Design an enzyme around this catalytic site. Structure first.
Site, PDB file in Angstrom:
ATOM      1  N   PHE A 142       0.770  -1.061   0.209  1.00  0.00           N
ATOM      2  CA  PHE A 142       0.097   0.028  -0.136  1.00  0.00           C
ATOM      3  C   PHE A 142       0.890   1.185   0.157  1.00  0.00           C
ATOM      4  CE2 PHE A 142      -3.973   2.032   0.460  1.00  0.00           C
ATOM      5  CZ  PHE A 142      -3.820   3.293   0.886  1.00  0.00           C
ATOM      6  N   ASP A 228       9.858   1.906   0.503  1.00  0.00           N
ATOM      7  CA  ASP A 228       8.880   2.587   1.206  1.00  0.00           C
ATOM      8  C   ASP A 228       8.786   2.709   2.621  1.00  0.00           C
ATOM      9  OD1 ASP A 228       6.498   4.014   1.857  1.00  0.00           O
ATOM     10  OD2 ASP A 228       5.222   3.084   0.450  1.00  0.00           O
ATOM     11  N   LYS A 257       4.476  11.051   6.616  1.00  0.00           N
ATOM     12  CA  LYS A 257       3.728  10.914   8.081  1.00  0.00           C
ATOM     13  C   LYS A 257       4.318  11.563   9.004  1.00  0.00           C
ATOM     14  CE  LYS A 257       0.695   6.999   6.334  1.00  0.00           C
ATOM     15  NZ  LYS A 257       0.634   5.784   5.805  1.00  0.00           N
TER      16      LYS A 257
HETATM   17  C1  LIG Z   1       0.425   5.652   4.406  1.00  0.00           C
HETATM   18  C2  LIG Z   1       1.361   5.244   3.530  1.00  0.00           C
HETATM   19  C3  LIG Z   1       1.465   5.880   2.387  1.00  0.00           C
HETATM   20  C4  LIG Z   1       0.644   6.935   1.810  1.00  0.00           C
HETATM   21  O1  LIG Z   1       0.607   7.834   2.643  1.00  0.00           O
HETATM   22  P1  LIG Z   1      -0.632   9.330   2.243  1.00  0.00           P
HETATM   23  O2  LIG Z   1      -0.047  10.452   2.966  1.00  0.00           O
HETATM   24  O3  LIG Z   1      -2.062   8.767   2.903  1.00  0.00           O
HETATM   25  O4  LIG Z   1      -0.636   9.338   0.698  1.00  0.00           O
HETATM   26  C5  LIG Z   1       2.368   5.262   1.233  1.00  0.00           C
HETATM   27  N1  LIG Z   1       3.351   4.146   1.947  1.00  0.00           N
HETATM   28  C6  LIG Z   1       3.039   3.712   3.106  1.00  0.00           C
HETATM   29  C7  LIG Z   1       4.061   2.601   3.300  1.00  0.00           C
HETATM   30  C8  LIG Z   1       2.185   4.233   3.875  1.00  0.00           C
HETATM   31  O5  LIG Z   1       1.971   3.514   5.090  1.00  0.00           O
END
Ligand SMILES: *Cc1c(COP(=O)(O)O)cnc(C)c1O
Ligand SMILES: *Cc1c(COP(=O)(O)O)cnc(C)c1O
EC number: 2.6.1.13
Lengths: 404, 404
Positions: A142, A228, A257
């Protein structure tokens, strides 16, 4: 008078889109590990806004950095320079030891940027014919909700009804080294994007040696390793990056985040010159990307993680969390897993007993968690939590689980 | 000591990506219509961060809304409710007269959301077979930098080296009603996305009656009219929405940029229930999307536009800007165009005389503008500007243009 919790739900139902089904709780205030709803009830935050508030809600140092900069300058766009961006860029690059950083706002934007980077590098450097470049992804991934992001998802909820989809995206099983090695035989593959721990998939931790095998395979076949770390990064798992656990250095690292402490949408794409400089001026950007306000809070958010040694705290306290959770009965809790303070339990779901129901009673007993599936509950509290505070929260979990 | 302007450039060159070539100016402070560089020099801001600071830099009301909310709550994620989002949603929907709003952060995210909305509606309501849905775009469009956004671009700078591209995106000429009517014969077309005035294309204003012809054609062929008002919206062109000029009501309206006054990345997707509710819970979202902090500044940013009647001001002052610009010699300035305070001039570029050189001397004489092309300069100052301030700025433009 002031709206009740049910009034808040009712209003959003009427005037807001229906793209979420949240846990019924209406928070108006947050400080550190705690949240307060509109009725005044206090809760332990065991979600941390998906690891966006690793530093705790409204961390005074980050709040001050915001309040200071808003009186000065908030957005010039990138058509002009601002005084703050360069200071942030030097800081974050020396911290994670990469030549350069490309600033974006949301996590999905960082991923979109990494794809464009990988593709451009693949054509202009690797020599792939246009436009035959592929990017491999792991099943259960994701990285957001754009058309491109859902094109690599294996979750029907993400992609169903939103096609047609982005070509050049291939999918292999997670935690599968042979499957990666098979996929990288195709010389048109530009990159492999992967989470060191899959968050939304349910805190799926890959076997030891996976990240090292990935690095080895990528280097061998001249393929870019994209890590990621938007969720797993920034002290959440016990280290600066989750890949530090195997001393692995990805080609591209994605942060988001927690990079702001939940005060501003700030994301980052870290990589070296020979990858980064494939994108020439005017070939990429974002209006708010790299703005001075977001930069000040990002610097402050990173300084908190270092100063307060939250990576160390997350590692020690995570062990205690997992060891205590494993004491719960096997016929009730199937599995316990995670690294640092990114953890999850698997419950023996029946037709009348599920993770949602567990989280509702959790809420009632003063702890907020979200189920990621009918049988998976994720436990990820802010890294500022103390051991006595953790153990109190563990007792609420024990009480609630056993009360059924 | 403190960095010089050249030091700021040098640092970003070393530690930052090379995805922009900005006008050489290092701003540290901004207030209203003015910006100050690190040497202390004062400039008229005639870019407004791409219409992100329509309300002027650091507007006290919006700053207060930010400072107030950061001490309370900044991000719960959408896994839980917060007290502020519902208040914002009711406000913005009643303002623009649509049933619901779906909150995102950046402009491209609003567009990505509109595509998913149009596709989902196209399959689940219109009856299009999966996955044969098309979306038509106008040549010269710009709605961001994601893989999907650049897939509908006609600008080689946006898409070259970043393929393969998103299928189901068709391109027709802008300001072309017959070309639209031809394209909508295909019953697999779900929507048409278009800017009422194309910003990045060089403030390209379509003929009168175009927006009405688009609305008529869409309704007729059961196609969704998506209006991208991220740049042209919020008083910039003299009205709440640029489409108000022809009393047209799009099916989906996209807002961004000025929605926050340049203090926070906040974007919006406005549409009615039968479109919006095609997306069910868990099928779309964003981590920061709809957070309470962004909502408070958005409410305040919208209240400023209304209270200070900036749409009216933009309309009156824009006329004066365009009338004064048209007095410049024809053999030097080819064309003048725009609506309200979104304007642009076209210059008779030679090999040794271009828009970049004009903007450099503009900067020297105390006004900041960006060229959108070798022969196009855009003039878009904040809407809080006064008539005497405008005329001063006009004299700087006259001085600079004629000085060559
Ligand atoms: C939450 C998340 C994203 C996307 O973050 P957003 O700010 O909601 O677009 C991408 N990669 C990982 C691993 C995530 O947990
Ligand atoms: C600037 C712009 C966008 C992009 O907004 P971002 O926040 O930079 O993603 C989209 N559409 C239009 C019409 C724009 O002017």
């Amino acid at each position: 008078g002031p709206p009740t919790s049910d009034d808040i739900f009712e209003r959003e139902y009427k005037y807001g889109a229906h793209n979420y089904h949240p846990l019924p709780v209406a928070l108006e205030r947050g400080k550190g590990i705690y949240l307060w709803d509109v009725e005044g009830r206090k809760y332990f935050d065991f979600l941390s806004s998906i690891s966006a508030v690793n530093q705790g809600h409204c961390h005074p140092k980050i709040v001050n950095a915001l309040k200071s900069q808003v009186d000065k300058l908030t957005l010039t766009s990138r058509a002009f320079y601002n005084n703050v961006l360069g200071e942030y860029e030097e800081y974050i690059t020396k911290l994670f030891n990469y030549h350069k950083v490309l600033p974006m706002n949301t996590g999905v934007e960082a991923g979109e940027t990494a794809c464009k980077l990988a593709r451009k590098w693949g054509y202009t450097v690797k020599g792939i014919q246009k436009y035959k470049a592929k990017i491999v992804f792991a099943a259960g991934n994701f990285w957001g909700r754009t058309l491109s992001a859902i094109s690599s998802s294996t979750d029907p909820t993400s992609y169903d009804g939103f096609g047609p989809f982005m070509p050049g995206f291939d999918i292999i099983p997670y935690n599968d080294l042979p499957a990666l090695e098979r996929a990288l035989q195709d010389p048109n593959v530009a990159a492999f994007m992967v989470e060191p721990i899959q968050g939304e998939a349910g805190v799926v931790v890959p076997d030891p040696g996976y990240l090292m095998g990935v690095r080895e395979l990528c280097t061998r076949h001249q393929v870019l390793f994209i890590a990621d770390e938007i969720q797993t990064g920034l002290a959440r798992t016990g280290r600066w990056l989750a890949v530090d656990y195997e001393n692995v250095r990805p080609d591209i690292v994605l942060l988001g985040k927690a990079l702001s402490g939940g005060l501003y949408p700030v994301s980052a794409v870290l990589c070296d010159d020979d990858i980064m400089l494939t994108i020439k001026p005017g070939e990429h950007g974002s209006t708010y990307g790299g703005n001075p306000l977001g930069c000040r809070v990002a610097i402050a958010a990173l300084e908190v993680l270092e100063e307060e040694n939250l990576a160390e705290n997350a590692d020690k306290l995570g062990i205690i969390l997992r060891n205590e959770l494993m004491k719960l009965p096997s016929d009730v809790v199937t599995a316990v897993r995670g690294k640092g303070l990114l953890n999850a339990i698997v419950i023996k779901e029946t037709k009348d007993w599920d993770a949602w129901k567990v989280c509702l009673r959790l809420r009632d007993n003063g702890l907020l968690a979200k189920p990621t599936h009918g049988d998976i509950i994720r436990f990820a509290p802010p890294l500022v939590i103390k051991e006595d505070e953790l153990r109190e929260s563990i007792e609420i979990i024990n009480k609630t689980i056993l009360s059924f």
